[model samples]
Target chain A: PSYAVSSRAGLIDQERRAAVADLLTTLHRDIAVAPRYLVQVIFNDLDAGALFLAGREAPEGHVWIHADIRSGRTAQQKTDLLEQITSKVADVLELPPEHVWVYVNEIPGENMTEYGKLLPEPGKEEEWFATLPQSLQEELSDL
Target chain B: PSYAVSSRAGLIDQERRAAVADLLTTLHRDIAVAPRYLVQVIFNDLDAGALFLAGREAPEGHVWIHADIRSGRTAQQKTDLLEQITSKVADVLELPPEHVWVYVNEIPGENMTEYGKLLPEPGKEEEWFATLPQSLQEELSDL
Candidate 1:
């Protein structure tokens, strides 16, 4: 999963996702060119009024967003990405992206679980249901 | 604190602490142990209806719980205790032991914070007295 933080609020899904993908691609090329793959992105969108360091409110009219990337990439790649992402986000919002902190935390792909040992997929309930145990099937017979 | 999944519930403070301590000793004996000995054990009672995973309701009979051995002696010893715990829990719950996931998430002891830095604590009201500024203190001194 990949996430992008921005000062821009009220972004639609398309805008948000596209922005995220763009940021990821930029990080991939300029930062982790060797490992050209990203698994997931988590976007933590902080509202304008969110509290930050020293209990201070965010600077007016600016949003502090954080993106955590789960990539099995090297430290240097992650570091370069962090620098580029900060700059890129700053350019997007017309603010010093350096002030917009971007942190990437890594975890192995297999160690993560989404929905009880089954990764969720759109329009795939039938496949999941077909594999239920016989006892569970009997229990669900009335449903 | 290392928490073991249990079908048994309703353990009060003394029993609860004992159970937890025992688990800690076992975990310390086997798995990767730490030098500082702070452990936490959380007992998951299947019937409490308290556990939920990622907003989805857990099945009635299973609960995912986290226990941290926040302080300990060594890692290898901790792993052994965790294995014994896994087996004991499986035997009691009548589920395959593999279905029970056990993990030791280590954290530093002194790095944790307990409460707000600026907030007032219980029963120390003298600091809240209206000493005021030097001017106010002078004025109050006459009284």
Candidate 2:
């Protein structure tokens, strides 16, 4: 699964939200090892004063992107991913780099679920894949 | 540490947001073994399309509450916490239980940080507390 993005309230308009969502989808597809078809994006808008950085309030128009994913990515991969996300979010939202905060919360894969089913860990995809219903298998394969 | 609430896309007004924040803070204080003063809350709002549930688009007004905290709470604690959060969120927002989704992402305490300092695992708080700067000790005690 990919991360969900929650813009601080009133940070962007509808068109910009769509652009960022598309950008995140494409980025996860190209870089995440997990199946892209299973990726999910959650867009949340909140009131101001909800996000803080370095114990200080974030400026207006700041975007706080929180991604929840399975643990096991390499440090290099994480560094690269954060850089890409930061750059892209700034570009799409017209915010300074300082205004964008990206937090990645890596949960153990077994702790995650879909339809009340446990998701497999990285490198254990085949085991989980084998357990999937044939129709879902065929569906995933096409992607 | 307590949970962080990210409001997606300006969905809640100021009064409701404050009420939820206080509720979360109070919940943590009452149940968590962690020091009440150490609890931190970060609020965020994001665009609506950024979140999805069951592989489908979340309905307008759907709320996704993600909580990040150190692991080691009993299964019962988690169950109760989820129930409390779900019920309170629904009650506060006047939404049905089904309209609110609460996700708890447990992180290893040693992997977490505050002010560049690593947090201790469950049952190891005293050890970590001793290492804090004197100023922090005074501050936390005062709270």
Candidate 3:
């Protein structure tokens, strides 16, 4: 249910976007939420004057990545995830660690939908995953 | 503290983006929080194949407006805000209501930052707003 890798317009190229999508998809797998859940990467390019931080226009290479996920992960899980995402984004986008901001917007499971169906509660993710096709299961296993 | 308007790449023209930004700014003002708190609008454009909904590729013109705001608005307030935003975005973008999706990601006030400073707690927003320059207050009043 997440999309958009936001940065100043024209700062990210096709290759960077693809790499981000790939890395995020793999991260989802490592977190054991892939296959059953989709992670889409949308690139959002803002005009120079549109983005700001601390009351000043943000410099180039400043990336604000927002993630929407069903909330239930532990504190450690979140910290680990945020750190990894920040580091990866900085590395891939050629930005300093401080230039990349990652905000995980946790959504209640009942509030989310897929295929017009409400998502299962956090504890029931595996149960929902079981209903997916064998192909998806195989793919997830490979991850 | 709000940021990022995520949509399909090249889907929004400059005029529409500006209109959306204006409307959003006004929306913030009408909600009684503006001027003192800046709401920068960053545009995030994603490739067509990179965004999905309900397990399928989203149709053209689909929009997902993500707003990060301090938590505490009543459910009705949120509902009204989302509805108004959806309507305004559709009207401005010339898309159908169903094509727009507005998700308000509520963050605890203490979790947000501006100018490298943490935001005031939810109940103290007005108090914080008062500390701004008189010119900013007058500006917000006109909004």
Please, what is the whole-model Cα lDDT of each candidate in the order they appear?
A: 0.42, 0.69, 0.68
Q: Chain A of candidate 1: what's the TM-score?
A: 0.54
Candidate 3 lDDT by residue in tens digits, B22-113: 77767765663445335656776677698888999888788888888778767776777788988987998999999888887777554443
Which ranges of candidate 1 are over 4 A from the true structure? A1-14, A25-30, A33-38, A53-55, A60-75, A106-143, B1-106, B113-143
| DockQ value for model 2 | 0.16
- In model 3, which regions exceed 4 Å deviation? A31-37, A54-56, A113-118, A135-143, B3-39, B43-66, B72-105, B109-143
Tens-place lDDT per residue, model 2, B76-123, is 666566677777877888876655656678878877887468888866
Summing lDDT over every window of 10 consecutive residues in candidate 3 chain B, give the lowest-scoring window: B110-119
Native-to-model Cα distance after best TM-score fit, residue A90 in candidate 2, in Å: 1.3
CA lDDT for candidate 3: 0.68
The TM-score obtained by model 3 is: 0.56
Evaluated with lDDT, which candidate comes out highest?
2
Candidate 1: C-alpha RMSD to true structure equals 15.2
- In model 1, state the lDDT of residue A79: 74
Kindly indicate the candidate among 2 and 3 with the higher lDDT.
Answer: 2
What is the fnat score of candidate 2? 0.19
